[PDB]
Structure formats: structure tokens, C-alpha cells
Amino acid sequence: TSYQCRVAVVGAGLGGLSAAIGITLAGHKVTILEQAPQLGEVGAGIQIPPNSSRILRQWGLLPALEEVSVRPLDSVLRSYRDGKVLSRINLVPGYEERFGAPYYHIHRADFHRILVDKARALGVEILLGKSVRTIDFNAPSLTMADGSVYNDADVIIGADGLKSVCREQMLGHPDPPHFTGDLAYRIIVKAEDMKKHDSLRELVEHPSINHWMGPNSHVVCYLLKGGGLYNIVLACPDDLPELVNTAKADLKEMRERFEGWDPRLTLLLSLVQETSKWRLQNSEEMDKWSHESGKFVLMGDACHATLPYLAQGAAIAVEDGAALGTLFAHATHPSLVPDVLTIYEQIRKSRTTRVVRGSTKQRDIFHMPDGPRQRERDRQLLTYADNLFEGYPNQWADPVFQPWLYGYNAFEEAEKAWQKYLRGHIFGTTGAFRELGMG
Numbered sequence: 001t002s003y004q005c006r007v008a009v010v011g012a013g014l015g016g017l018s019a020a021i022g023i024t025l026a027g028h029k030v031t032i033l034e035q036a037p038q039l040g041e042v043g044a045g046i047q048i049p050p051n052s053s054r055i056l057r058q059w060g061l062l063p064a065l066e067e068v069s070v071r072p073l074d075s076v077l078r079s080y081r082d083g084k085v086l087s088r089i090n091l092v093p094g095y096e097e098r099f100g101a102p103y104y105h106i107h108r109a110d111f112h113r114i115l116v117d118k119a120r121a122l123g124v125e126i127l128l129g130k131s132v133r134t135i136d137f138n139a140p141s142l143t144m145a146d147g148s149v150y151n152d153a154d155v156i157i158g159a160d161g162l163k164s165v166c167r168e169q170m171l172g173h174p175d176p177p178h179f180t181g182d183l184a185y186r187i188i189v190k191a192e193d194m195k196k197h198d199s200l201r202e203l204v205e206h207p208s209i210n211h212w213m214g215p216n217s218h219v220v221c222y223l224l225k226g227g228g229l230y231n232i233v234l235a236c237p238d239d240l241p242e243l244v245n246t247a248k249a250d251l252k253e254m255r256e257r258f259e260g261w262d263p264r265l266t267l268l269l270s271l272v273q274e275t276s277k278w279r280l281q282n283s284e285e286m287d288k289w290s291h292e293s294g295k296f297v298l299m300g301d302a303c304h305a306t307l308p309y310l311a312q313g314a315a316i317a318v319e320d321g322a323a324l325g326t327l328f329a330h331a332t333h334p335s336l337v338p339d340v341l342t343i344y345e346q347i348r349k350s351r352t353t354r355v356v357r358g359s360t361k362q363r364d365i366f367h368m369p370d371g372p373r374q375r376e377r378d379r380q381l382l383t384y385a386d387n388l389f390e391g392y393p394n395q396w397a398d399p400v401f402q403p404w405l406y407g408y409n410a411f412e413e414a415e416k417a418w419q420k421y422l423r424g425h426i427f428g429t430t431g432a433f434r435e436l437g438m439g
């Protein structure tokens with residue numbers, strides 16, 4: 001009769017499910033308490049880089065994913081004016097050869113649906129319609145919007161995303177998300193229609209991650225297998241306030257923001273099949289993800305919300321869940337649980353902040369206005385493309401940042417950390433392992 005911790009995950013996003021998967025595969029019973037009445041067959045494109053794919057592969061999800069995801073050949077940084085290529089990184093075969101795991105482009109609904117399916121296949125209960133409002137962190141209880149009280153859990157894990165009620169309850173005061181002051185426009189265009197125009201063909205027969213960097217704007221363009229649709233996301237300032245969000249509104253607005261940009265991006269505005277406009281936001285990092293009671297810890301965007309520039313938010317939420325799981329594997333005795341939550345924060349924060357920084361830095365590179373600093377950026381990109389250095393204006397190509405970002409194995413790192421904890425070398429723990437004969 002081994003020990004089984006009753007772990008309640010709040011929120012069924014990517015991070016919640018990754019945690020439910022890893023902890024169940026650890027030997028414990030997970031229950032996810034989401035807010036939405038039904039699962040989210042909703043969203044657009046997401047990127048699964050090696051540091052997240054290798055995790056999913058260890059959970060036997062590679063096939064189900066390959067079926068619905070694309071493998072971009074390379075990742076390209078281009079000037080906003082002419083489409084001029086300034087940096088090209090090889091992903092196929094480069095990234096599998098180096099970091100030993102695929103890089104994927106999958107629609108968010110497909111990724112969410114595969115993770116929900118694997119969660120259920122492992123026996124996780126997913127109780128929907130459970131909007132959590134208050135938390136008692138000592139006698140672990142969750143109180144819902146209807147009034148009901150869930151108290152069938154030993155440990156709680158906040159994974160409620162950006163608008164996290166869990167983080168508010170932990171801190172003891174409100175803490176809404178900070179508005180980046182930017183807004184995003186998502187556009188879906190059938191690739192059938194693009195193959196009809198000569199200037200666009202290269203983007204369909206050579207599926208890449210194309211980035212246009214420009215004055216306080218950037219445009220990302222990639223392909224997804226569904227409907228062979230092309231995702232075109234434009235990030236620009238919200239100098240305007242109407243929020244008029246009809247189909248024609250953006251077409252006008254996006255055309256205006258593309259004034260002077262690669263002629264190709266404006267052609268694409270004519271082949272639109274759907275438009276979507278929204279104001280970006282995120283949170284500022286937290287010093288503490290845990291509660292003094294040692295029964296609660298945050299994961300995902302709730303504690304380490306990242307700017308979308310690096311394409312790692314879900315990657316590092318998967319890493320969070322993977323590390324949680326790897327550590328709970330060692331939670332063979334209940335007194336071991338809080339120390340585990342401690343070893344996690346430490347190992348996860350040092351990683352999630354250094355990513356959060358990079359995203360911000362990538363922003364500064366992408367958004368440069370035309371001028372001397374832009375001229376130097378471009379110069380450096382082109383000149384040292386075959387002679388990389390630390391501080392290269394592409395954080396993805398940076399010879400130091402790059403292997404660190406994509407070579408990271410959440411499993412091995414959490415194991416290293418558990419061993420450090422067994423040699424008494426982890427600050428901030430209660431030393432539960434001592435009374436249990438481990439050493």
C-alpha cells in the first residue's frame with residue numbers, strides 16, 4: 001500500500017494537463033478543476049520546440065502529434081520593408097540532430113485534445129464547471145462560485161493561467177495582469193489561394209517560421225496542417241481605442257499597419273478567411289510560487305507569464321509539469337511533499353526567469369525602429385551569421401542561449417536537484433528526508 005497524494009490541479013490548460021500527466025505517471029491521483037463548462041477546442045497555432053517535444057515523446061505522444069503537426073524547415077528573421085532575409089536558422093534536420101527532438105507547429109486545439117486524451121487514459125478526473133474563488137491553504141480546500149467546497153485533496157497546484165485566482169488568493173491581495181500596451185491581429189489564409197500568386201509560393205513549398213521585424217511591430221507567419229491554413233499574427237501598438245472588431249475593421253486596420261511592409265504581407269490581407277483582434281497582456285514575475293503551509297504551488301503563466309516573442313510559454317509549462325511529476329515520483333512519504341514543492345520552484349524559477357528575460361530581449365530586437373540602431377542590428381545579423389557570438393541579435397541563434405533553451409531536459413534537472421536535496425544541499429527545505437532515513 002504505497003503513498004498516494006491527492007493532488008488537485010486548478011485549470012485544464014496545457015500546463016495543468018502536463019502536471020496531471022507527470023504526477024499520475026508518478027503514482028498519485030490527480031483531479032483537474034477547470035472553470036469553462038467544456039474543454040477548449042479553441043485557439044490558433046502553437047510551437048512545440050525540442051525541450052517540450054522530448055518530454056511529450058517520453059509520454060508516448062509523438063505519433064498522435066505528428067499526425068496533426070508540421071515540421072518547419074527553418075526559422076527566418078526578415079526586414080519589414082523588403083522581406084529581406086537577415087537571419088536563417090536550420091531546424092530540419094538541424095534541431096533533431098543537435099537536441100534530439102522534433103520542433104512542431106500544431107494547432108492549439110489539437111495539442112490540447114491530445115493532452116486531455118492522454119490524461120483521461122491515465123485516469124485523471126476532470127471536473128468542469130468548477131470556478132474557484134477562495135482557497136484555504138492549510139486544510140486544503142477549494143471553494144467554488146456556486147458555494148460548493150472541494151476538500152478531497154492533499155495538495156493544490158495552481159494552473160489557472162494569466163487571470164489566476166490562485167495567485168491572488170495565495171498573495172492575499174488582488175493582482176490583475178499588466179497590459180503590454182500592444183495588440184495582436186490573427187489572420188488565417190488558405191494555402192491553396194497562396195499557391196495561386198507567384199510571390200507567395202515559396203512560403204508554401206518551403207514551410208518555415210517567417211518573422212518580419214519592424215518599427216514597434218512584428219509579423220509571424222507559419223503553416224498548420226488543418227485546412228492547409230496559414231497563420232499570420234501581427235503584433236503592433238494599440239495607439240487606437242475603438243476595439244471595433246468586425247471582419248472589415250481589421251482589413252482596413254491591418255492594411256494601414258502594413259503601410260510600407262513587404263508587399264507580400266499586404267497581398268495576404270486580400271486572401272483572408274478569418275480575422276481576430278485582441279489586446280495583449282501578461283504578469284510580472286513572482287518571488288514566491290509556494291505558500292508557507294507547504295500545500296500549494298503555482299505553475300505556468302500564473303507564476304512565470306512570458307512575452308510571446310520566444311515561443312516558449314507552453315514549452316516551459318510542459319517543463320513545469322514534467323518537473324512536478326519527476327519530483328512527486330520521489331514523494332513516497334507525505335512529509336516529503338512540501339520539500340518537493342520547494343525543490344521545484346527553485347529549479348523552475350531559475351529557468352523560467354531566464355526565459356522571461358530572453359523574450360523581453362527578443363522584443364527589443366524585433367521592435368527596433370528604423371535608424372542607426374536598426375542599421376547596426378541588421379549589420380550584425382548578416383555579418384556574423386557564420387561566426388556567431390554571445391549577444392547575437394537573434395536569441396534563437398545565440399550560441400549560448402540556444403543550446404541552453406533547447407537542450408534542457410526537465411527530467412534530468414529535477415533528478416539532479418533531488419540528489420542535491422538528499423545530500424542536504426537545497427536551501428529552504430524542512431529536511432523531511434532526514435527523519436525518513438534517506439541520506
Ligand SMILES: Cc1cc2nc3c(=O)[nH]c(=O)nc-3n(C[C@H](O)[C@H](O)[C@H](O)COP(=O)(O)OP(=O)(O)OC[C@H]3O[C@@H](n4cnc5c(N)ncnc54)[C@H](O)[C@@H]3O)c2cc1C
Nearest residue numbers: 011013014015035047132160161165300301311313314315
Ligand atoms: C499570442 C500568443 C502566442 C503564443 N505562442 C506560443 C508558441 O508558439 N509556443 C509556446 O510554447 N507558447 C506559446 N504561447 C504561450 C502559451 O499560449 C501559454 O504559455 C499556455 O497557455 C500556458 O498554459 P497554462 O496551463 O500555463 O495556462 P492556460 O493555458 O491559460 O490555462 C488556464 C486555464 O485555467 C482556467 N482558469 C482560469 N481561471 C480559473 C479559475 N479561477 N478557476 C478555474 N480554472 C480557471 C482557464 O479557463 C484555462 O482553461 C503563446 C501565447 C500567446 C498569447
